[PDB]
Amino acid sequence: GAMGAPARIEEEELTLTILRQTGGLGISIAGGKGSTPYKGDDEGIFISRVSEEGPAARAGVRVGDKLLEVNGVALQGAEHHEAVEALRGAGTAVQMRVWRERMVEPENAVTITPLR
């Protein structure tokens, strides 16, 4: 596999741990695609379900956080089912990684500005 690597910006590396929900119900992700990788192995998974400051989302995610690997399982190219299958048993302790690129991460976010 090798088509190109146009969007390959310096990675930041953000490891987060999501333990069993302590009030809510964890989070909610959804990917699925199966298209050529950005830099050989990358798809970018999105989610939407912030927790009430507990071990479910706030632990690292934030309603739509850029993630690549889920619970140690590279979601690069994988499908929504591949990302959930990892959270199944990891429900008690999930380990997802967050990387920054020229896609998953929107320009609006790339800007480090306040909200006042």
Swiss-Prot record:
Domain spans labelled PDZ: 15-102
Subcellular location: Cell membrane; Cell junction; Cell junction, Adherens junction; Cell projection, Lamellipodium
Range of residues in the leader sequence: none
Disulfide bonds: none
PTM: Ubiquitinated; targeted for UBE3A-dependent multiubiquitination in the presence of high-risk HPV E6 proteins and degraded.
Phosphothreonine: residues bearing it: T113
Expression across tissues: Expressed in kidney, skeletal muscles, liver, lung, breast, intestine, placenta and skin mainly in epithelial cells (at protein level).
Modification type Phosphoserine: residues: S51
Disease: Neural tube defects: Congenital malformations of the central nervous system and adjacent structures related to defective neural tube closure during the first trimester of pregnancy. Failure of neural tube closure can occur at any level of the embryonic axis. Common NTD forms include anencephaly, myelomeningocele and spina bifida, which result from the failure of fusion in the cranial and spinal region of the neural tube. NTDs have a multifactorial etiology encompassing both genetic and environmental components.
Quaternary organization: Interacts with UBE3A. Interacts with PAK1 and PAK2. Interacts (via PDZ domains) with VANGL2. Interacts (via PDZ domains) with LPP and TRIP6; the interaction is direct. Interacts (via PDZ domains) with TJP2. Interacts (via PDZ domains) with APC; may mediate APC targeting to adherens junctions of epithelial cells. Interacts (via PDZ domains) with TSHR; regulates TSHR trafficking and function. Interacts with ARHGEF7 and GIT1; interacts directly with ARHGEF7. Interacts with CTNNB1. Interacts with MAPK12. Interacts (via PDZ domains 1 and 3) with MCC. Interacts with DLG5. (Microbial infection) Interacts (via fourth PDZ domain) with tick-borne encephalitis virus RNA-directed RNA polymerase NS5; this interaction targets viral NS5 to the cell membrane periphery and nucleus and prevents STAT1 phosphorylation, and thus, the activation of the JAK-STAT signaling pathway. Interacts with HPV E6. Interacts with influenza A virus protein NS1; the interaction results in the translocation of SCRIB from the cell membrane to perinuclear puncta.
Family, per entry: Belongs to the LAP (LRR and PDZ) protein family.
Entry function: Scaffold protein involved in different aspects of polarized cell differentiation regulating epithelial and neuronal morphogenesis and T-cell polarization. Via its interaction with CRTAM, required for the late phase polarization of a subset of CD4+ T-cells, which in turn regulates TCR-mediated proliferation and IFNG and IL22 production. Plays a role in cell directional movement, cell orientation, cell sheet organization and Golgi complex polarization at the cell migration front. Promotes epithelial cell layer barrier function via maintaining cell-cell adhesion.
Protein name: Protein scribble homolog
Record organism: Homo sapiens (Human)
Source taxonomy: Eukaryota, Metazoa, Chordata, Craniata, Vertebrata
